Each structure stands twice: as structure tokens, then as C-alpha cells.
Amino acid sequence: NKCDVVVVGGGISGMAAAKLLHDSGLNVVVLEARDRVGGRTYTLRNQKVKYVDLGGSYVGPTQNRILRLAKELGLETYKVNEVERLIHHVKGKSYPFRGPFPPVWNPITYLDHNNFWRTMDDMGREIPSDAPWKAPLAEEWDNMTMKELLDKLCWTESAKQLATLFVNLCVTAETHEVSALWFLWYVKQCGGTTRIISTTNGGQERKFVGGSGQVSERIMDLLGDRVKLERPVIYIDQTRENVLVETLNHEMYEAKYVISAIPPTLGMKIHFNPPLPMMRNQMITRVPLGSVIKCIVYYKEPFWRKKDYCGTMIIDGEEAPVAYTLDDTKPEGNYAAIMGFILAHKARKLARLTKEERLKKLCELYAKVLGSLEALEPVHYEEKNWCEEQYSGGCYTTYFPPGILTQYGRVLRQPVDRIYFAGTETATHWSGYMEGAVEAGERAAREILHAMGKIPEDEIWQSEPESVDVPAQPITTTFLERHLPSVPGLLRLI
Amino acid sequence: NKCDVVVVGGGISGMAAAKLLHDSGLNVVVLEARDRVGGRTYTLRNQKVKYVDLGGSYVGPTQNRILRLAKELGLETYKVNEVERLIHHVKGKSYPFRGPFPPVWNPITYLDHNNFWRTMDDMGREIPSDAPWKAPLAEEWDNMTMKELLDKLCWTESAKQLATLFVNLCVTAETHEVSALWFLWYVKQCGGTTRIISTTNGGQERKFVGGSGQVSERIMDLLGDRVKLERPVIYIDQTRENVLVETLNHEMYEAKYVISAIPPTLGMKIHFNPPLPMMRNQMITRVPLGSVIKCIVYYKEPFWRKKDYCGTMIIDGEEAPVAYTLDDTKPEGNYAAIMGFILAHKARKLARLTKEERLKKLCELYAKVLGSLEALEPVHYEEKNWCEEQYSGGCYTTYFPPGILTQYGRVLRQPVDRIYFAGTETATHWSGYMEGAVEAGERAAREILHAMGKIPEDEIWQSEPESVDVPAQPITTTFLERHLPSVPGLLRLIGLTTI
Ligand SMILES: *Cc1cc2c(cc1C)nc1c(=O)[nH]c(=O)nc-1n2C[C@H](O)[C@H](O)[C@H](O)COP(=O)(O)OP(=O)(O)OC[C@H]1O[C@@H](n2cnc3c(N)ncnc32)[C@H](O)[C@@H]1O
Ligand SMILES: *Cc1cc2c(cc1C)nc1c(=O)[nH]c(=O)nc-1n2C[C@H](O)[C@H](O)[C@H](O)COP(=O)(O)OP(=O)(O)OC[C@H]1O[C@@H](n2cnc3c(N)ncnc32)[C@H](O)[C@@H]1O
Ligand SMILES: CCc1ccc(CCOc2ccc(C[C@H]3SC(=O)NC3=O)cc2)nc1
Ligand SMILES: CCc1ccc(CCOc2ccc(C[C@H]3SC(=O)NC3=O)cc2)nc1
């Protein structure tokens, strides 16, 4: 019944918040709707796969909070395989390459591609990470979709196809679904185009040995019986001295403060007394999550490596079910596997099929792209469609349709009386990722410590020392990349 | 706790559904979250106003279901005042006019305005009322906002300005917030541009004597103790032979079937066992309601009539808090009043002020638009910001952002095991309105009667005889309206002769 703080949600953010408060000497309780912890992370274990991340998996340089938390819990990382060549498959042909950038051979098309990525980062430099609505052109950019921006910027269909894939893969949503301002903020707050797309020296550099689900699991181990599973919160009452929190299974909890560590829209599943302020009331109806099926096909051997391919495939176009893959083989070289994402509208379309039907489509696609009949002989298959999850709403994260971020963005982390807001969606660096989940959970926890008079105001937001295990190398550009003209810039010189 | 059908929501749609089922001999229960029925309709009564609709109010020709239901319940309508001139206020100046269309004198501007409304209706004719996602260019149109479509179509700032106000006023949302396909559907399913904008011969022709809240109240009277107030539904369980419905105040109800008669996104407030199918699970996170404050300023007399103004003002410009007003005086001629809407972003922006501050801003605006110092002397004020409502989510209705209607639209009224879906959002004619609430409630009820083997399949969807009290004049166009060129059409003709 009685405690200092109730945390709603036992994903990484809620767990990180509860741990910090617990370590500080407060009595905490975590109320989790599911029969498991981890939320948008989920590590499946069976003999065929050993373990596999069906939700969030990747960590990399500059994500120092998640790396520090995992290390403390006794976890280690290994590198996602990028020794051999990456593949860009365009108009029915595979083009192997090295470096983070797919090569472009046509000179006009080259200028167009170069300008697109450069312009994304140029625009990002004017968007504050902690307040994107304060961008000088916030309203102009928020009132446009990414489709509109791409249509204006890309003079070649080639650039437009890759730019579209980029949007789809970053935020599991269609270019026409999302605000340009929000999307440009999203990329900038991960460190820019190069950092977000990169395996080596980027967001996809590493995975956790044994799976990312261990983060939430091991914190639940540390919290004893303070984690309550199968307790979906249904009601929060702030009319009295202590806050009252009621669960679906009829239990009542009493606390001084609450942390909401669930996706913003899932706040709708809770009935509030008194009602929420107008702006939050409407905000939580305006913020959907994206759509994705994560699919892992297993093979006897990582056969692609013999052809000097690392397993990374970037696959343009409408026909392909999967637009992007990475090698999911274990560090020992066993449990050979390819991870692929079925993105946005394709998640919706292909959900109608059977598991076996999807397996066949993926195997035939991979056989074409890798140029190998070995892709047609899988030994095992696992997948998860995150669109079906009542207590997630989708994956990877929440996207903002046009007009929403400028009108409602401010209220995302604004406290409501004694309710404070965590969740990766409220982070200012790697929001959308496990890193942002840690940042937001610890910040929300420290807001409460400050409310209790335990720490000063300047300690609410705290820097993180760089990981020694996963250090970051700087992102560089070339002289030509910085100074080559766009297509219309070349036209104006003519 | 045992019944045949549980209806979730006691707005017009749930009440219409419950009444039909009750009349058919079934045992119904209505579970309503609030301490009142009516939902997005709410009639305030006090001595200063007598009565006033703070939510949905207007009915008109072609809305035959709401008119028939209200008539059966003993209600009467009266006509909104449109005897005198309307006002279009643009660039700080007022232009009085008659007819549904603000006058446009500049011939280029006239062609552009004519073509804009014509094209809205032309495109609408391509969109099936019962399946907008089946339009030939559904995907192209759904992947565009209304802002993009206006930018393409309007060759004058004058047309773009009025078109923007039109969207804001129809759906309480910004042009950049909404899908072009969805908005084009929304207008077409109300009968088109002329019908949706008109007072005389359109959606705003009439109000109910005594207020629209009487519709839901009188149905509650008919149903007696079957309506349960302050029972917000939290949980629906379909894993066993009969459906189990749990409320916040700790009550359990058992039923053969359920009708969900709440705004689609408010489905999120219910925990489902088993979980909803993927498409509905995501759909209910993708469908917000609009933003509006409805404001009524009272005066000693309807002084605007003396200057040959009916009370209708169409007000363009960022600075104006209210973009549209109608005379709200009682049919007897007393309790003189102006009704105004604060729309979309302005509802958000102006919510920060006090009630007294909003009243001052409205009076100052009305004084300028009407050229009348008497507008600075209000005797009373009432208002309601629908953005603050936990159990509405907004008003008037649900809008669809770009890309959503084609991807998720088909599941809006698709049954989920033994749950059937009512609510105005699921209607095919005047969706968003009290009329659509009746259509959807009665249709959902008949879906259940069919499932029980009580009526044949062809009786699920039923036509409605035209009101004898509110006849519908047809929507007509002139030869010139049909065949005058667009601005680019004129330019093509110019470039053709110059050869
Ligand atoms: C789904 C997904 C996510 C993902 C990704 C691929 C997929 C398919 N790949 C990632 C990656 O490679 N690297 C990375 O860093 N992130 C990746 N992501 C996203 C990542 O998983 C998320 O950013 C992160 O997991 C989010 O953490 P957070 O703690 O903020 O949120 P959550 O996991 O959703 O946890 C919320 C918990 O709350 C519970 N819940 C929901 N409603 C209630 C109620 N009413 N009462 C009590 N509890 C509730 C949820 O069940 C959940 O456990
Ligand atoms: C708000 C508004 C609406 C409006 C308008 C002006 C404003 C300011 N002008 C209109 C007009 O002039 N003419 C017209 O025909 N319509 C106008 N509108 C729209 C109109 O009010 C709506 O279309 C109509 O009232 C909607 O009816 P419907 O029955 O479909 O929906 P509802 O009124 O919202 O009723 C839903 C009920 O369900 C209850 N609820 C919500 N959640 C729960 C849960 N969890 N459990 C139990 N009950 C629940 C709500 O409280 C409500 O009563
Ligand atoms: C800047 C030039 C460029 C343009 C597009 C691509 C194709 C690959 O793009 C990517 C885009 C996003 C991501 C990150 C994706 S992958 C994941 O697990 N989670 C993510 O957020 C990974 C790769 N490569 C290079
Ligand atoms: C076709 C040419 C034209 C273009 C716009 C206007 C300005 C008025 O536009 C209107 C637009 C919508 C509405 C209906 C609004 S008012 C209400 O109570 N609920 C509604 O849906 C009423 C008027 N007049 C004429």
C-alpha cells in the first residue's frame, strides 16, 4: 500500500528511475502491466537461438548512460559484424561497398545525395535538443511533412528513394506521416546523420551479450519484491494529501510522488482525478508510435562472409518486404542469422500473412540480394510484430504528425502536480532509444529528489562520463562534402 | 448485472442504440462515465440564459434521422436568424452580403474562388461515402495535407485565406494537421460545400427549442434505471461465454454483446482481454479530436438587427480570436446573444486567459466587425472549452492526419468478436454531427439484432424518410459556375491564342 514513489511502467526508463530512488534510500514500488519487465525490449531464450533480442538491441558510442548502467549490472557488449562489405540493392542489382555511405556513380545524382544529408544536418544545427519548438523556423518546419521536404530537396528519384528509406528506417513511419521539424530534431538529437546510420562508430555498433532484456531483469532482481507484475495502472487520484494509484487487479497504492514511465499516448489507459490539464489531455491523443516487425532468419553458417559480405543490406523500393538487415550471428560465430525490419506500411500489409509465408518472402529476397542459394535453406525463424502490443502501442518510438510538436511539445515533461514524466520520448539525447530511456528515468527521479529538498536544482540534469569500453570517435566531413553545390546550385552557375 | 447488451457511452449515439434495442424487446444497460448524459451535447440551464447549448446545437435539411428521433421525443425546432445581412470581415474591414457566398468582385479572384469550391466537390464525387479508401487516387490524396492541396489549387491569397477559414471551421483543426483525402470525404458525406456552409438550406438552419441535451435526457427518461451514471468503463473481457464489462467504481456487468459508443481514441481508456487486433490497437492512437471553445455573449437587445445585420460574421485574420459567429437569440426575441467559435490553434493559445479576459477580447472584436459600440456592453457570458474534457477529448469530432485513413480506415466500424461500434465517427452521412450519431447508434444496434437472428442482413442499413417539417432544397449550380475556367485554365487559353 504505502511508499515514497510509485513508478508506472517497468521498462528500462521506469527501472532506471526506481533504481536511482532506491539507491538514495527511498521506498519505491514499480507497477508493471505485463507478466514481464523490459517493455519495448524483450530477449527470447530457447535452445535453437540461445537468446535473441526481439525488441531494442543496439547500443553504440555516445550512449554513455545505458553503457554505464549495463556495466554496473554485470553486462558486456560485442560488436555487430561489419568486417566485410555492405550491400546497397537498387533497381534489382547488388552494389557492395565500404564506409557508411552507399556510393553514387552519376555526378548529378552524387550532388543531389550529398546535398540531402548535408541539408538535414544544416537544419538540425538550428534546433535546440531540449526545446525543438524554439527553432527559429519551428512553425514553418512543423507545418510540413517529411514527404514535402524531400520532394522540395531531392532533384533525383535516386536520392528520394534513399531519403525515404532513411526516414522509414529511423522512425518506422512514412515520410508523409511525420512532421519535418520533429524528424529533423530526432536526427540531430542522436548526433546527426552519420552517427544515426552508422554501425562502426554509430548507433548500431554493439549488442549486449545475452540480450538487452537483462538490463530490466537485473534491476528487478535488485529491487526484490518492489516490482509488481500484472498490475496495469487504471486510475490516479491526486485530490488528497497522498497520491492514490489503482491497478486493474484491484490493488491500491499510496505515495508522495508518481513517475509515469510509459509511452505518452498510453497515458490514455489511465483515468485521472482531477482531470489532466487541457494541453496534456489532448497531447496524449496526438502522439502515435511507429510500426515494425522484427524478423530473424537463422542459418547453419554465416555464409555471406565467404562472399566478402558482412550481412548488411540496404534494399530500396516498394516490392522488397525488408528494407534493411544486419548480421545477427553470435560473437562466437555460431547461431548464424540475419536480422531484418519490415517497416511502416509494410508491417501493416504483411501482417495478414502466416509466419511461414513471411519466412519464404524473406529467404527469397535475401537469396537475390546476397546472390546465394544458401539463403533459401533457413534452419530456424523468430519474429515479433510490435503493432499488436496493447502496452507498447508500436515500435521503436513515438512520432509527431505535422503541427503537433510546436503546439504540444512543451508539455511532454511538464509535471502534473505530483506526477513526473520519464520514458525515452522525454529524453534530450537519443530519445527513442534505450539510452534516452536511462536519461529520462534518472532525470525524472532527480526531479522528485529536488522536490523533496534532497538535492539542489542544478543536479536535476547531470552529464555522463564517456564509456572507456565504447569510446566515440569524431564525425568528420570532407572538403568536397562541405562545398560541392546542390543540383539547383549547379544550375544557377549555368 | 446481467443483460442482453451493454452500451458504453450515453451520448446521442449510445442513447439511440439503447432505445432501438429496448424497443425491440431486449434488456439493455447504458454505462456512462459522467454524472450526466449527452456527451458532446450539453445544455446549460440558469436564470440568466434560460437554456443554452454549449456543445452540439444545429440541425438542418437532409439530417432526417436526428429530426425524426427528436420529433418522436416531443421536441421542436426553430430557425437560426438569417433575415438580415451576413458580414465577411477581411483585412480589417466589414463587407455585408446576402446569399451563402461572400461576394468577390475582382474577376481573377472570382475565377479562383469559383474553381476552389467546385474542385472540392469534384474531388468529393470520386470518394465513396462508405469507403473513402476506395477512391481512385485515395493514396495520393491521403498522403497530402489540406495545406498542400490549398497551396496547389489557390492562385490567389483571397481564395487561400477563405479556404483556410473553411477548413478550420468545419473540422476545428489546422489545414496542415489534416489529410486531404479525409477532409474531402468529410465535406462530401455532408452533401458538399454549399450544404455544409449554409444556414438557410444547410447544416446550421435550426436549433432545438429548449436545447439539444433534451434528446439524451428524454431517452434516459424512457430507459429509467437502465442508465448508469458515473460508471466509466475500464475493462472488457471476451474470453468467456458472455462478455464482462467492468467500471471504475468497481461494478461488473455481463452481456451477450457490447456497443462501444465513445470517440474512437477514447477506446484507449479501456483495457481489453484478449488484446485488440493489431490494426484497431494502433488505429485508436492515430485519431485525435479537434480543438474549440464555444463562447456566447449576451446583450440587452439584438442590436445588430437594427443595422440590418443578422448576427453572422465570417472573420478572417490571425488577430481575431473568433472566426465565426451566429445570432443565438431565443426564438421569442429575448436573451439576445452572439455565439462564437475560437478554433484550432486559437483555442490552445487563448485558453491561457481568464474568462473575463476572453469576454473583453470578443466584445472588442464584435464592436469593430459590427461597427457598434453597443457590443462593448455585454450583460452575461457563458463558454466551454471542449479541449479540457477527459471523456470527450475535444470537439466537434475526430480528424485524420495524413496517411491514416487509407491504412486504418477500414477497421473503424469492424466488429471485434462481440463488440460493435457506434458513435458519430462511424457514420456515412453527416459523420461528426448529431445526425451521424443517430445513424451509427441505430446501425450498430441492428448489427446486433442480425447477429441474434432477429432481422435479415439487408435490414442492418436503413434509409430514412425525408422530414415533412424540414424539407431539403436541392443543391444547384449555374451554367457559369460549372463552366468558367480556373486561373491556370484561363492562362492556358491566353497562351493558346498567342500562337
Ligand atoms: C520495439 C523495438 C524497439 C527498439 C528497436 C527495435 C524494436 C523492434 N531497436 C532499438 C535498438 O536497437 N536500440 C535502442 O536503443 N532502442 C531500440 N528500440 C527502442 C527501445 O526499445 C526503446 O526506446 C526503449 O525500450 C523504451 O524504454 P521505456 O522504458 O521508455 O519504455 P517501454 O519499454 O515501453 O516501457 C514502458 C513499460 O510500461 C508498461 N506499461 C504500459 N502501460 C502501463 C500501465 N497502464 N500500467 C503499468 N505499466 C504499464 C509497459 O508494459 C512497459 O513495460
Ligand atoms: C463539442 C461540440 C460538438 C458539436 C458542435 C459544437 C461543439 C462545441 N456543434 C454541432 C452542431 O451544431 N450540430 C451537430 O449536429 N453537431 C455538433 N457538434 C458535434 C456533436 O456534438 C457530436 O457529433 C455528437 O454529440 C456526438 O455524439 P456521440 O454519441 O457519437 O458521441 P459523444 O457525445 O461524445 O458521447 C460519448 C459518451 O461516452 C461517454 N464516455 C467516454 N468514455 C467512456 C467510458 N470509458 N465509459 C463510459 N462512458 C464513456 C462520454 O462521457 C459521452 O457521454
Ligand atoms: C547518410 C547516408 C546514408 C543514408 C542511408 C543509409 C541506409 C542506412 O540508413 C540507416 C538509417 C537508420 C539506421 C538506424 C535504425 S537501425 C535500428 O536498429 N534502429 C534504427 O534507428 C541505420 C541505417 N546509409 C547511409
Ligand atoms: C462555399 C463558399 C463559402 C466558403 C466559406 C464561407 C464562410 C462560412 O463557412 C462555413 C464553414 C463551415 C460551417 C459549418 C460549421 S459551423 C458549426 O456549427 N459547425 C460546423 O461544422 C459554416 C460556415 N462561406 C461561403
Three-state SS for A432?
A: coil
Q: How many CB atoms lie within 10 A of CB A436?
A: 27
Do the domain assignments include residue B481?
no
| Residue corresponding to grid cell 492562362 | B491
Instruction: Write out A245-273 in H/E/C secondary structure.
Output: EEECCCCEEEECEEEECCCHHHHHHCEEE
Residue A85: give the domain boundaries. 40-60+77-105+198-208+288-400
Question: Are B300 and B357 in a shared domain?
Answer: yes
- Solving technique for this entry? X-ray
Number of structural domains, chain A? Answer: 3
Atom number of ligand 4 nearest to Cα B162: 5
Cell numbers describing residue A337: 542469422
Q: How many CB atoms lie within 10 A of CB B334?
A: 12
User: ω into residue A391 within 30 of 0, thus cis?
Assistant: no
Q: Number of C-alpha atoms within 13 angstroms, CB side, residue B456?
A: 1
What is the distance between the alpha carbons of residues A258 and A444, in angstroms, rounded to a whole number? 10
Cα separation of A18 and A27, whole Å? 9
* Coarse DSSP helix, strand, coil percentages of chain A, rounded to the nearest 5 percent: 35, 20, 45
The grid coordinates of residue A157 equal: 528519384
Has residue B17 been placed in a domain? yes
Chain A residues touching residue B148 (CB < 8 angstroms): 148
Q: Is the dihedral of CA A373, A377, A380, A381 positive or negative?
A: positive
Beta bridge partners of B244: B237, B254
Closest C-alpha to B271, from B281, B279, B261: B281
| Cα A25 to Cα A4, A47, A219, A228, A371, distances in angstroms | 10, 41, 16, 19, 59
Residue A475 lies in a domain: no
- Centre of ligand 3 to C-alpha A195, Å, is 9
Q: Quick one: A303 and A393 in the same domain?
A: yes
Residue B324 and residue B190 in one domain: no
Angstroms from A84 CA to nearest CA on chain B: 38
Angle at alpha carbon of residue B284, lines to B281 and B289, rounded to 5°: 175
Residue B389 and residue B286 in contact, taking contact as beta carbons nearer than 8 Å = no
Question: Last residue of a domain, which of A375, A400, A425?
Answer: A400
Q: Are A370 and A304 in contact (CB under 8 A)?
A: yes
- A487 contacts A155 by C-beta, under 8 angstroms: yes
* Alpha-carbon gap, residue A67 to A75, rounded angstroms: 9
CB-CB neighbours of A117 under 10 Å: 21
How far is residue B216's CA from residue B434's CA, in Å, rounded to a whole number?
A: 11
Q: Assess if residue B353 is contained within a domain.
A: yes
Please state, as a whole number, how many other Cβ atoms lie within 10 Å of the Cβ of residue B320. Answer: 20
| Calpha distance B405→B132 (Å, rounded) | 8
Question: Cβ(A132)–Cβ(A409) under 8 Å?
Answer: yes
Residue carrying C-alpha cell 490567389: B156
In DSSP terms, B253 is beta-bridged to B245
CB B246 within 8 A of CB B252: yes
Residues A266 and A410 reside in one and the same domain: yes
Candidates B3, B434, B10; CA nearest to B260 is: B10
Q: A381 lies in a domain?
A: yes
CATH at residue A45? 3.90.660.10
Q: Between B281, B393, B407, which is nearest A345 by CB?
A: B407
- The last residue of a domain, from among B381, B400, B419: B400
**B34 and B55, same domain (yes or no):** no
Phi and psi (nearest 5°) for A21? -65, -45
Let me know if residue B466 belongs to a domain: no
φ, ψ of residue A478 in degrees (nearest 5): -95, 165
Q: Which residues line ligand 1 (CB under 6 A)?
A: A 8-14, 31-34, 39-41, 55-58, 232-233, 261-263, 266, 269-270, 292, 294, 386, 391-392, 395-397, 423-424, 432-435, 437
Interatomic CA distance for residues B202 and B80, integer angstroms:
11
Q: How far apart are CA A414 and CA A416, in angstroms?
A: 7
- One domain for residues A335 and A384: yes
Chain B residues whose CB is inside 8 A of the A289 CB are: 282, 285
User: Taking CB atoms and an 8 Å limit, are B387 and A289 in contact across chains?
Assistant: no
Do A203 and A311 belong to one domain? yes
Clarify whether residues B69 and B141 are in a common domain: no
- Which CATH number belongs to the domain containing residue B147 in this structure? 1.10.405.10
Distance between CA atoms of B192 and B302, rounded to whole angstroms?
32
Tell me: do B214 and B327 sit in the same domain: no
Chain A CA closest to residue B141? A176
Q: Which residue, A239, A241, A233, is CA-closest to A271?
A: A233
Show which of A385, A400, A415 is a domain's final residue: A400
Measure in Å the smallest separation between the Cα of A347 and chain B Cα atoms. Answer: 10
DSSP A158: H
Ligand nearest the Cα of residue A216 is 1
Q: Are residues B424 and B439 in the same domain?
A: yes
Residue A471: inside a domain: no
Enter the C-alpha cell of residue B336: 439576445
| Cα gap A349→A321, rounded to integer Å | 10
> Is B177 in the same domain as B225?
no
Chain B nearest-CA distance from A177, in A, is 6
Does residue A432 belong to any structural domain of this protein? yes
Are residue A303 and residue A388 in the same domain, yes or no? yes
